[PDB]
Amino acid sequence: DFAKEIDARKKELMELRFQAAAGQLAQPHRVRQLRREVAQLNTVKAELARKGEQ
RNA sequence: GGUCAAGAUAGUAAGGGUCCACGGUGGAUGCCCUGGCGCUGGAGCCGAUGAAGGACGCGAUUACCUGCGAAAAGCCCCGACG
Ligand SMILES: [Mg+2]
Ligand SMILES: [Mg+2]
Numbered sequence: 635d636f637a638k639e640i641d642a643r644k645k646e647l648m649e650l651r652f653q654a655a656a657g658q659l660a661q662p663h664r665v666r667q668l669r670r671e672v673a674q675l676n677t678v679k680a681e682l683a684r685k686g687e688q
Numbered sequence: 689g690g691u692c693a694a695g696a697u698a699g700u701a702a703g704g705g706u707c708c709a710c711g712g713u714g715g716a717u718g719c720c721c722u723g724g725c726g727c728u729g730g731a732g733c734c735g736a737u738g739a740a741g742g743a744c745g746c747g748a749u750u751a752c753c754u755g756c757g758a759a760a761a762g763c764c765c766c767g768a769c770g
């Protein structure tokens with residue numbers, strides 16, 4: 635299921651980039667906060683990959 | 689006092705010179721250290737699970753440096769500080 639939440643994050647992240655090329659970007663923090671949720675995502679996936687399979 | 693004669697003799701500065709005073713220039717000098725040099729003593733290999741050194745790129749705004757790498761001034765677990 636993890637990839638679904640990853641890509642849902644990626645869509646709004648690109649939406650923020652698109653506004654940021656424009657004059658609208660009132661909450662820049664949401665930018666970097668959206669990316670760490672991606673990284674944590676991927677990280678935890680690797681944390682399951684070794685688990686169980688050994 | 690006046691005229692004539694003969695004689696001697698100042699001052700003037702265009703610009704200059706020596707000295708004094710006030711600056712401009714310039715960055716010597718003292719002081720300092722954000723940087724070096726040397727000795728002693730430690731520690732001493734990286735790489736095909738990708739080295740050394742790089743090229744692009746990552747930031748709301750980022751030309752240079754750092755750090756980092758599309759999971760990108762970073763992600764997770766432990767411990768320390770508070
Ligand atoms: Mg005469
Ligand atoms: Mg002087």
Ligand SMILES: [Mg+2]
Pocket residue numbers: none
């Ligand atoms: Mg010194």
Ligand SMILES: [Mg+2]
Pocket residue numbers: 739
């Ligand atoms: Mg290397």
Ligand SMILES: [Mg+2]
Pocket residue numbers: none
């Ligand atoms: Mg950008």
Ligand SMILES: [Mg+2]
Pocket residue numbers: none
């Ligand atoms: Mg990937």
Ligand SMILES: [Mg+2]
Pocket residue numbers: 769770
């Ligand atoms: Mg502290």
